[PDB]
Amino acid sequence: RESMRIELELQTDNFTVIPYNHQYYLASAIYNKIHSANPAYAKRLHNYQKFKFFTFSLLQIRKRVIRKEGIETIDGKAYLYISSPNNEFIENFVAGLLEDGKLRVGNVEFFVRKAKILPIPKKFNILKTISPIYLKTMIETEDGLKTYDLLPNNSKFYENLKNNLKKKYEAFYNEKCDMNFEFEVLKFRPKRMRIKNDIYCRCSEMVFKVWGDYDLIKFGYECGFGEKNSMGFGMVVNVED
């Protein structure tokens, strides 16, 4: 029992455009696989129907053309990264995805070809989001209680990001988080992301340096940073030196 990250290698038709707004449909597709009655998932994921300690990336395209509506994949390939501090969840989900063999995101149909195992980095220095970080706090307004989306230029972002990770650590491991980490934001861009039929939030695409306790950073690396990890938010990747 340890963490696990996989790269799902997906294949659709050559020259297909993956819309800029695909994340919402991707999240729905992943949810629907996990909660499917298909026996490929049902037996394997029976104990994980309410499991929220995992994350996944946006669809990544390597051979790409920027288009008006999205990113075109010239060779039809796309890559989806999925990770959890629970390796049994990841192994079971991957076995189901490979047996099923197909993933539809919006109007794009993928074949699920292979799942590449990505061992955890032995050291962390620079991280960048491959799905943006969501972090919110509730605030009283003249129109009642509302949700405020924290970004790195908010004074509360820093400690709220840390405390979210420490609380998630305790919730997942059922042990005290006696660890700490710190970070420095090198770059960030806000991104508008649909999260419900009618709710859009502001999330952070960002690059940041980290230091502190390796085991806590490693938990953020495989669980995700910030909130709504299991809806596909907050996944990061190491940036090579």
PDB file of all heavy atoms in Angstrom, residues 158-188:
ATOM      1  N   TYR A 158      -2.264  31.267   0.647  1.00  0.00           N
ATOM      2  CA  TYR A 158      -1.089  30.512   1.060  1.00  0.00           C
ATOM      3  C   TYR A 158      -1.418  29.528   2.184  1.00  0.00           C
ATOM      4  O   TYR A 158      -1.189  28.309   2.069  1.00  0.00           O
ATOM      5  CB  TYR A 158       0.021  31.492   1.474  1.00  0.00           C
ATOM      6  CG  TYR A 158       1.357  30.846   1.659  1.00  0.00           C
ATOM      7  CD1 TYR A 158       2.222  30.665   0.572  1.00  0.00           C
ATOM      8  CD2 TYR A 158       1.775  30.408   2.911  1.00  0.00           C
ATOM      9  CE1 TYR A 158       3.441  30.048   0.728  1.00  0.00           C
ATOM     10  CE2 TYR A 158       3.001  29.790   3.079  1.00  0.00           C
ATOM     11  CZ  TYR A 158       3.826  29.606   1.968  1.00  0.00           C
ATOM     12  OH  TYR A 158       5.040  29.006   2.099  1.00  0.00           O
ATOM     13  N   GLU A 159      -1.929  30.050   3.307  1.00  0.00           N
ATOM     14  CA  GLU A 159      -2.200  29.156   4.421  1.00  0.00           C
ATOM     15  C   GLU A 159      -3.384  28.253   4.132  1.00  0.00           C
ATOM     16  O   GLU A 159      -3.427  27.127   4.630  1.00  0.00           O
ATOM     17  CB  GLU A 159      -2.429  29.959   5.712  1.00  0.00           C
ATOM     18  CG  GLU A 159      -1.109  30.549   6.266  1.00  0.00           C
ATOM     19  CD  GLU A 159      -0.046  29.481   6.563  1.00  0.00           C
ATOM     20  OE1 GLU A 159      -0.391  28.402   7.096  1.00  0.00           O
ATOM     21  OE2 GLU A 159       1.147  29.720   6.270  1.00  0.00           O
ATOM     22  N   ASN A 160      -4.359  28.719   3.361  1.00  0.00           N
ATOM     23  CA  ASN A 160      -5.497  27.856   3.070  1.00  0.00           C
ATOM     24  C   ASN A 160      -5.091  26.664   2.206  1.00  0.00           C
ATOM     25  O   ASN A 160      -5.593  25.554   2.411  1.00  0.00           O
ATOM     26  CB  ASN A 160      -6.623  28.646   2.425  1.00  0.00           C
ATOM     27  CG  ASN A 160      -7.458  29.369   3.473  1.00  0.00           C
ATOM     28  OD1 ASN A 160      -6.916  29.833   4.477  1.00  0.00           O
ATOM     29  ND2 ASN A 160      -8.755  29.457   3.260  1.00  0.00           N
ATOM     30  N   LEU A 161      -4.165  26.869   1.261  1.00  0.00           N
ATOM     31  CA  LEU A 161      -3.646  25.740   0.469  1.00  0.00           C
ATOM     32  C   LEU A 161      -2.904  24.743   1.368  1.00  0.00           C
ATOM     33  O   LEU A 161      -3.093  23.514   1.262  1.00  0.00           O
ATOM     34  CB  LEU A 161      -2.727  26.263  -0.649  1.00  0.00           C
ATOM     35  CG  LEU A 161      -2.346  25.169  -1.683  1.00  0.00           C
ATOM     36  CD1 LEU A 161      -3.617  24.802  -2.496  1.00  0.00           C
ATOM     37  CD2 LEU A 161      -1.234  25.627  -2.611  1.00  0.00           C
ATOM     38  N   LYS A 162      -2.045  25.256   2.266  1.00  0.00           N
ATOM     39  CA  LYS A 162      -1.329  24.363   3.183  1.00  0.00           C
ATOM     40  C   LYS A 162      -2.291  23.604   4.101  1.00  0.00           C
ATOM     41  O   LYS A 162      -2.156  22.395   4.302  1.00  0.00           O
ATOM     42  CB  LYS A 162      -0.325  25.164   4.014  1.00  0.00           C
ATOM     43  CG  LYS A 162       0.874  25.687   3.173  1.00  0.00           C
ATOM     44  CD  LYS A 162       1.781  26.584   3.995  1.00  0.00           C
ATOM     45  CE  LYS A 162       2.166  25.919   5.296  1.00  0.00           C
ATOM     46  NZ  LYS A 162       3.177  26.748   5.989  1.00  0.00           N
ATOM     47  N   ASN A 163      -3.243  24.312   4.696  1.00  0.00           N
ATOM     48  CA  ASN A 163      -4.130  23.679   5.660  1.00  0.00           C
ATOM     49  C   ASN A 163      -5.066  22.700   4.985  1.00  0.00           C
ATOM     50  O   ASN A 163      -5.400  21.663   5.568  1.00  0.00           O
ATOM     51  CB  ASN A 163      -4.909  24.729   6.433  1.00  0.00           C
ATOM     52  CG  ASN A 163      -4.022  25.469   7.410  1.00  0.00           C
ATOM     53  OD1 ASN A 163      -3.068  24.882   7.932  1.00  0.00           O
ATOM     54  ND2 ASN A 163      -4.332  26.736   7.683  1.00  0.00           N
ATOM     55  N   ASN A 164      -5.480  22.991   3.758  1.00  0.00           N
ATOM     56  CA  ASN A 164      -6.238  21.997   3.026  1.00  0.00           C
ATOM     57  C   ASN A 164      -5.431  20.705   2.897  1.00  0.00           C
ATOM     58  O   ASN A 164      -5.957  19.609   3.144  1.00  0.00           O
ATOM     59  CB  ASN A 164      -6.606  22.529   1.635  1.00  0.00           C
ATOM     60  CG  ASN A 164      -7.109  21.420   0.730  1.00  0.00           C
ATOM     61  OD1 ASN A 164      -6.319  20.712   0.090  1.00  0.00           O
ATOM     62  ND2 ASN A 164      -8.414  21.239   0.711  1.00  0.00           N
ATOM     63  N   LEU A 165      -4.140  20.819   2.519  1.00  0.00           N
ATOM     64  CA  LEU A 165      -3.357  19.597   2.320  1.00  0.00           C
ATOM     65  C   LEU A 165      -3.187  18.834   3.627  1.00  0.00           C
ATOM     66  O   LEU A 165      -3.296  17.607   3.655  1.00  0.00           O
ATOM     67  CB  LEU A 165      -1.975  19.907   1.724  1.00  0.00           C
ATOM     68  CG  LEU A 165      -1.268  18.665   1.130  1.00  0.00           C
ATOM     69  CD1 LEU A 165      -2.092  18.127  -0.035  1.00  0.00           C
ATOM     70  CD2 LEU A 165       0.167  18.962   0.701  1.00  0.00           C
ATOM     71  N   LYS A 166      -2.916  19.551   4.726  1.00  0.00           N
ATOM     72  CA  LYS A 166      -2.723  18.881   6.011  1.00  0.00           C
ATOM     73  C   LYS A 166      -4.017  18.206   6.481  1.00  0.00           C
ATOM     74  O   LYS A 166      -3.992  17.063   6.975  1.00  0.00           O
ATOM     75  CB  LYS A 166      -2.228  19.899   7.041  1.00  0.00           C
ATOM     76  CG  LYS A 166      -0.824  20.464   6.697  1.00  0.00           C
ATOM     77  CD  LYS A 166      -0.434  21.602   7.653  1.00  0.00           C
ATOM     78  CE  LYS A 166       1.007  22.077   7.430  1.00  0.00           C
ATOM     79  NZ  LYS A 166       1.359  23.302   8.230  1.00  0.00           N
ATOM     80  N   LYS A 167      -5.159  18.879   6.304  1.00  0.00           N
ATOM     81  CA  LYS A 167      -6.423  18.252   6.699  1.00  0.00           C
ATOM     82  C   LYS A 167      -6.733  17.021   5.853  1.00  0.00           C
ATOM     83  O   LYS A 167      -7.226  16.015   6.373  1.00  0.00           O
ATOM     84  CB  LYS A 167      -7.552  19.268   6.591  1.00  0.00           C
ATOM     85  CG  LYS A 167      -7.477  20.372   7.647  1.00  0.00           C
ATOM     86  CD  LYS A 167      -8.592  21.391   7.441  1.00  0.00           C
ATOM     87  CE  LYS A 167      -8.358  22.659   8.254  1.00  0.00           C
ATOM     88  NZ  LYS A 167      -9.063  23.832   7.646  1.00  0.00           N
ATOM     89  N   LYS A 168      -6.482  17.095   4.542  1.00  0.00           N
ATOM     90  CA  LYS A 168      -6.686  15.941   3.665  1.00  0.00           C
ATOM     91  C   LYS A 168      -5.771  14.801   4.040  1.00  0.00           C
ATOM     92  O   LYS A 168      -6.178  13.637   4.002  1.00  0.00           O
ATOM     93  CB  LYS A 168      -6.442  16.307   2.171  1.00  0.00           C
ATOM     94  CG  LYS A 168      -7.526  17.100   1.529  1.00  0.00           C
ATOM     95  CD  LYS A 168      -7.343  17.100  -0.045  1.00  0.00           C
ATOM     96  CE  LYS A 168      -5.885  17.395  -0.441  1.00  0.00           C
ATOM     97  NZ  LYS A 168      -5.855  18.205  -1.736  1.00  0.00           N
ATOM     98  N   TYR A 169      -4.511  15.117   4.392  1.00  0.00           N
ATOM     99  CA  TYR A 169      -3.585  14.093   4.853  1.00  0.00           C
ATOM    100  C   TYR A 169      -4.179  13.340   6.054  1.00  0.00           C
ATOM    101  O   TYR A 169      -4.181  12.105   6.087  1.00  0.00           O
ATOM    102  CB  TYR A 169      -2.238  14.724   5.236  1.00  0.00           C
ATOM    103  CG  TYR A 169      -1.214  13.733   5.673  1.00  0.00           C
ATOM    104  CD1 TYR A 169      -0.228  13.295   4.796  1.00  0.00           C
ATOM    105  CD2 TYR A 169      -1.219  13.216   6.980  1.00  0.00           C
ATOM    106  CE1 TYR A 169       0.717  12.380   5.189  1.00  0.00           C
ATOM    107  CE2 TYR A 169      -0.291  12.300   7.372  1.00  0.00           C
ATOM    108  CZ  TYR A 169       0.680  11.882   6.476  1.00  0.00           C
ATOM    109  OH  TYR A 169       1.618  10.954   6.858  1.00  0.00           O
ATOM    110  N   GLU A 170      -4.665  14.085   7.048  1.00  0.00           N
ATOM    111  CA  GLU A 170      -5.236  13.425   8.221  1.00  0.00           C
ATOM    112  C   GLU A 170      -6.499  12.656   7.859  1.00  0.00           C
ATOM    113  O   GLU A 170      -6.755  11.585   8.423  1.00  0.00           O
ATOM    114  CB  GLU A 170      -5.533  14.439   9.342  1.00  0.00           C
ATOM    115  CG  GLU A 170      -4.269  15.121   9.805  1.00  0.00           C
ATOM    116  CD  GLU A 170      -4.438  15.925  11.086  1.00  0.00           C
ATOM    117  OE1 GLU A 170      -5.593  16.210  11.497  1.00  0.00           O
ATOM    118  OE2 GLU A 170      -3.388  16.277  11.656  1.00  0.00           O
ATOM    119  N   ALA A 171      -7.307  13.188   6.935  1.00  0.00           N
ATOM    120  CA  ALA A 171      -8.544  12.497   6.560  1.00  0.00           C
ATOM    121  C   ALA A 171      -8.245  11.208   5.819  1.00  0.00           C
ATOM    122  O   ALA A 171      -8.960  10.210   5.988  1.00  0.00           O
ATOM    123  CB  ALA A 171      -9.445  13.393   5.702  1.00  0.00           C
ATOM    124  N   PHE A 172      -7.188  11.192   5.000  1.00  0.00           N
ATOM    125  CA  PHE A 172      -6.878   9.973   4.242  1.00  0.00           C
ATOM    126  C   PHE A 172      -6.168   8.937   5.098  1.00  0.00           C
ATOM    127  O   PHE A 172      -6.518   7.750   5.055  1.00  0.00           O
ATOM    128  CB  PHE A 172      -5.996  10.266   3.027  1.00  0.00           C
ATOM    129  CG  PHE A 172      -5.628   9.031   2.270  1.00  0.00           C
ATOM    130  CD1 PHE A 172      -6.586   8.397   1.485  1.00  0.00           C
ATOM    131  CD2 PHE A 172      -4.356   8.485   2.350  1.00  0.00           C
ATOM    132  CE1 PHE A 172      -6.272   7.222   0.769  1.00  0.00           C
ATOM    133  CE2 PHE A 172      -4.022   7.310   1.638  1.00  0.00           C
ATOM    134  CZ  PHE A 172      -4.991   6.685   0.832  1.00  0.00           C
ATOM    135  N   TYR A 173      -5.144   9.363   5.860  1.00  0.00           N
ATOM    136  CA  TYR A 173      -4.321   8.414   6.596  1.00  0.00           C
ATOM    137  C   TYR A 173      -4.863   8.099   7.985  1.00  0.00           C
ATOM    138  O   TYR A 173      -4.436   7.094   8.566  1.00  0.00           O
ATOM    139  CB  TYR A 173      -2.872   8.939   6.752  1.00  0.00           C
ATOM    140  CG  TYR A 173      -2.104   8.811   5.455  1.00  0.00           C
ATOM    141  CD1 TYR A 173      -1.715   9.941   4.734  1.00  0.00           C
ATOM    142  CD2 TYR A 173      -1.809   7.552   4.936  1.00  0.00           C
ATOM    143  CE1 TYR A 173      -1.013   9.805   3.518  1.00  0.00           C
ATOM    144  CE2 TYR A 173      -1.123   7.410   3.730  1.00  0.00           C
ATOM    145  CZ  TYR A 173      -0.747   8.544   3.029  1.00  0.00           C
ATOM    146  OH  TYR A 173      -0.064   8.358   1.831  1.00  0.00           O
ATOM    147  N   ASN A 174      -5.805   8.895   8.489  1.00  0.00           N
ATOM    148  CA  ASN A 174      -6.269   8.752   9.871  1.00  0.00           C
ATOM    149  C   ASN A 174      -5.079   8.724  10.831  1.00  0.00           C
ATOM    150  O   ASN A 174      -4.960   7.855  11.694  1.00  0.00           O
ATOM    151  CB  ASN A 174      -7.151   7.519  10.021  1.00  0.00           C
ATOM    152  CG  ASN A 174      -8.517   7.715   9.376  1.00  0.00           C
ATOM    153  OD1 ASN A 174      -9.211   8.684   9.659  1.00  0.00           O
ATOM    154  ND2 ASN A 174      -8.869   6.828   8.475  1.00  0.00           N
ATOM    155  N   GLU A 175      -4.168   9.672  10.632  1.00  0.00           N
ATOM    156  CA  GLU A 175      -3.006   9.876  11.489  1.00  0.00           C
ATOM    157  C   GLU A 175      -2.734  11.360  11.509  1.00  0.00           C
ATOM    158  O   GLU A 175      -3.128  12.094  10.589  1.00  0.00           O
ATOM    159  CB  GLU A 175      -1.744   9.134  11.004  1.00  0.00           C
ATOM    160  CG  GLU A 175      -1.874   7.645  10.808  1.00  0.00           C
ATOM    161  CD  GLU A 175      -2.025   6.875  12.129  1.00  0.00           C
ATOM    162  OE1 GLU A 175      -1.891   7.487  13.228  1.00  0.00           O
ATOM    163  OE2 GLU A 175      -2.286   5.654  12.065  1.00  0.00           O
ATOM    164  N   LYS A 176      -2.045  11.799  12.559  1.00  0.00           N
ATOM    165  CA  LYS A 176      -1.725  13.215  12.686  1.00  0.00           C
ATOM    166  C   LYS A 176      -0.754  13.628  11.577  1.00  0.00           C
ATOM    167  O   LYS A 176       0.143  12.862  11.197  1.00  0.00           O
ATOM    168  CB  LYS A 176      -1.089  13.500  14.041  1.00  0.00           C
ATOM    169  CG  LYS A 176      -0.939  14.977  14.289  1.00  0.00           C
ATOM    170  CD  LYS A 176      -0.426  15.253  15.676  1.00  0.00           C
ATOM    171  CE  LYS A 176      -0.418  16.742  15.966  1.00  0.00           C
ATOM    172  NZ  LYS A 176       0.094  16.988  17.338  1.00  0.00           N
ATOM    173  N   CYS A 177      -0.973  14.815  11.032  1.00  0.00           N
ATOM    174  CA  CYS A 177      -0.034  15.388  10.070  1.00  0.00           C
ATOM    175  C   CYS A 177       0.907  16.265  10.884  1.00  0.00           C
ATOM    176  O   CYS A 177       0.594  17.404  11.216  1.00  0.00           O
ATOM    177  CB  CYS A 177      -0.759  16.178   8.999  1.00  0.00           C
ATOM    178  SG  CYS A 177       0.418  16.825   7.732  1.00  0.00           S
ATOM    179  N   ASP A 178       2.038  15.684  11.275  1.00  0.00           N
ATOM    180  CA  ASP A 178       3.111  16.375  11.978  1.00  0.00           C
ATOM    181  C   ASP A 178       4.140  16.942  11.016  1.00  0.00           C
ATOM    182  O   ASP A 178       5.329  16.972  11.332  1.00  0.00           O
ATOM    183  CB  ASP A 178       3.807  15.413  12.943  1.00  0.00           C
ATOM    184  CG  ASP A 178       3.060  15.241  14.239  1.00  0.00           C
ATOM    185  OD1 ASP A 178       2.428  16.218  14.695  1.00  0.00           O
ATOM    186  OD2 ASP A 178       3.122  14.128  14.808  1.00  0.00           O
ATOM    187  N   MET A 179       3.727  17.302   9.814  1.00  0.00           N
ATOM    188  CA  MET A 179       4.654  17.733   8.783  1.00  0.00           C
ATOM    189  C   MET A 179       4.266  19.114   8.294  1.00  0.00           C
ATOM    190  O   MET A 179       3.180  19.630   8.567  1.00  0.00           O
ATOM    191  CB  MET A 179       4.684  16.738   7.617  1.00  0.00           C
ATOM    192  CG  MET A 179       5.338  15.450   7.987  1.00  0.00           C
ATOM    193  SD  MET A 179       5.392  14.255   6.652  1.00  0.00           S
ATOM    194  CE  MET A 179       3.621  13.857   6.524  1.00  0.00           C
ATOM    195  N   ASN A 180       5.181  19.714   7.544  1.00  0.00           N
ATOM    196  CA  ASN A 180       4.951  21.038   7.024  1.00  0.00           C
ATOM    197  C   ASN A 180       5.637  21.148   5.669  1.00  0.00           C
ATOM    198  O   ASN A 180       6.515  20.352   5.328  1.00  0.00           O
ATOM    199  CB  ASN A 180       5.452  22.108   8.001  1.00  0.00           C
ATOM    200  CG  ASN A 180       5.118  23.502   7.538  1.00  0.00           C
ATOM    201  OD1 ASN A 180       3.954  23.827   7.325  1.00  0.00           O
ATOM    202  ND2 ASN A 180       6.134  24.358   7.426  1.00  0.00           N
ATOM    203  N   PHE A 181       5.171  22.097   4.875  1.00  0.00           N
ATOM    204  CA  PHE A 181       5.884  22.458   3.663  1.00  0.00           C
ATOM    205  C   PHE A 181       5.657  23.939   3.420  1.00  0.00           C
ATOM    206  O   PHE A 181       4.818  24.577   4.068  1.00  0.00           O
ATOM    207  CB  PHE A 181       5.434  21.596   2.465  1.00  0.00           C
ATOM    208  CG  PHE A 181       4.120  22.031   1.852  1.00  0.00           C
ATOM    209  CD1 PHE A 181       4.099  22.705   0.635  1.00  0.00           C
ATOM    210  CD2 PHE A 181       2.899  21.732   2.465  1.00  0.00           C
ATOM    211  CE1 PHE A 181       2.898  23.091   0.056  1.00  0.00           C
ATOM    212  CE2 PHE A 181       1.695  22.099   1.873  1.00  0.00           C
ATOM    213  CZ  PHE A 181       1.692  22.792   0.681  1.00  0.00           C
ATOM    214  N   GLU A 182       6.443  24.495   2.490  1.00  0.00           N
ATOM    215  CA  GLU A 182       6.310  25.881   2.059  1.00  0.00           C
ATOM    216  C   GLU A 182       6.453  25.915   0.544  1.00  0.00           C
ATOM    217  O   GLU A 182       6.870  24.935  -0.080  1.00  0.00           O
ATOM    218  CB  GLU A 182       7.366  26.787   2.717  1.00  0.00           C
ATOM    219  CG  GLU A 182       7.473  26.623   4.239  1.00  0.00           C
ATOM    220  CD  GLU A 182       6.301  27.234   5.005  1.00  0.00           C
ATOM    221  OE1 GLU A 182       5.468  27.957   4.406  1.00  0.00           O
ATOM    222  OE2 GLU A 182       6.248  27.027   6.240  1.00  0.00           O
ATOM    223  N   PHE A 183       6.090  27.051  -0.042  1.00  0.00           N
ATOM    224  CA  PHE A 183       6.184  27.153  -1.481  1.00  0.00           C
ATOM    225  C   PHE A 183       6.334  28.596  -1.913  1.00  0.00           C
ATOM    226  O   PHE A 183       6.051  29.535  -1.166  1.00  0.00           O
ATOM    227  CB  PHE A 183       4.980  26.484  -2.176  1.00  0.00           C
ATOM    228  CG  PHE A 183       3.649  27.131  -1.924  1.00  0.00           C
ATOM    229  CD1 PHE A 183       3.091  28.007  -2.845  1.00  0.00           C
ATOM    230  CD2 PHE A 183       2.896  26.776  -0.799  1.00  0.00           C
ATOM    231  CE1 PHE A 183       1.809  28.566  -2.613  1.00  0.00           C
ATOM    232  CE2 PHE A 183       1.634  27.311  -0.572  1.00  0.00           C
ATOM    233  CZ  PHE A 183       1.075  28.211  -1.478  1.00  0.00           C
ATOM    234  N   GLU A 184       6.758  28.756  -3.160  1.00  0.00           N
ATOM    235  CA  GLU A 184       6.863  30.070  -3.767  1.00  0.00           C
ATOM    236  C   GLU A 184       6.242  29.977  -5.148  1.00  0.00           C
ATOM    237  O   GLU A 184       6.662  29.149  -5.967  1.00  0.00           O
ATOM    238  CB  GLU A 184       8.311  30.543  -3.856  1.00  0.00           C
ATOM    239  CG  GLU A 184       8.420  31.882  -4.561  1.00  0.00           C
ATOM    240  CD  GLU A 184       9.862  32.317  -4.797  1.00  0.00           C
ATOM    241  OE1 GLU A 184      10.791  31.624  -4.311  1.00  0.00           O
ATOM    242  OE2 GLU A 184      10.057  33.354  -5.475  1.00  0.00           O
ATOM    243  N   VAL A 185       5.246  30.815  -5.391  1.00  0.00           N
ATOM    244  CA  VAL A 185       4.565  30.851  -6.680  1.00  0.00           C
ATOM    245  C   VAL A 185       5.468  31.568  -7.672  1.00  0.00           C
ATOM    246  O   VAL A 185       5.849  32.724  -7.459  1.00  0.00           O
ATOM    247  CB  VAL A 185       3.201  31.550  -6.563  1.00  0.00           C
ATOM    248  CG1 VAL A 185       2.486  31.606  -7.942  1.00  0.00           C
ATOM    249  CG2 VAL A 185       2.353  30.844  -5.540  1.00  0.00           C
ATOM    250  N   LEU A 186       5.812  30.885  -8.757  1.00  0.00           N
ATOM    251  CA  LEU A 186       6.622  31.506  -9.794  1.00  0.00           C
ATOM    252  C   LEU A 186       5.761  32.153 -10.857  1.00  0.00           C
ATOM    253  O   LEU A 186       6.157  33.175 -11.433  1.00  0.00           O
ATOM    254  CB  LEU A 186       7.530  30.472 -10.453  1.00  0.00           C
ATOM    255  CG  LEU A 186       8.415  29.712  -9.474  1.00  0.00           C
ATOM    256  CD1 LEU A 186       9.258  28.737 -10.211  1.00  0.00           C
ATOM    257  CD2 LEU A 186       9.281  30.699  -8.673  1.00  0.00           C
ATOM    258  N   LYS A 187       4.588  31.585 -11.111  1.00  0.00           N
ATOM    259  CA  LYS A 187       3.729  32.110 -12.165  1.00  0.00           C
ATOM    260  C   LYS A 187       2.326  31.569 -11.949  1.00  0.00           C
ATOM    261  O   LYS A 187       2.175  30.422 -11.530  1.00  0.00           O
ATOM    262  CB  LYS A 187       4.277  31.686 -13.535  1.00  0.00           C
ATOM    263  CG  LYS A 187       3.460  32.096 -14.747  1.00  0.00           C
ATOM    264  CD  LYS A 187       3.969  31.333 -15.982  1.00  0.00           C
ATOM    265  CE  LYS A 187       3.233  31.751 -17.261  1.00  0.00           C
ATOM    266  NZ  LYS A 187       3.867  31.204 -18.502  1.00  0.00           N
ATOM    267  N   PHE A 188       1.308  32.379 -12.232  1.00  0.00           N
ATOM    268  CA  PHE A 188      -0.057  31.853 -12.190  1.00  0.00           C
ATOM    269  C   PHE A 188      -0.945  32.619 -13.154  1.00  0.00           C
ATOM    270  O   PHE A 188      -0.690  33.778 -13.475  1.00  0.00           O
ATOM    271  CB  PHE A 188      -0.651  31.861 -10.765  1.00  0.00           C
ATOM    272  CG  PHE A 188      -1.399  33.117 -10.405  1.00  0.00           C
ATOM    273  CD1 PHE A 188      -2.766  33.219 -10.633  1.00  0.00           C
ATOM    274  CD2 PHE A 188      -0.739  34.181  -9.811  1.00  0.00           C
ATOM    275  CE1 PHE A 188      -3.463  34.382 -10.287  1.00  0.00           C
ATOM    276  CE2 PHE A 188      -1.428  35.344  -9.462  1.00  0.00           C
ATOM    277  CZ  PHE A 188      -2.783  35.439  -9.694  1.00  0.00           C
TER     278      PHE A 188
END
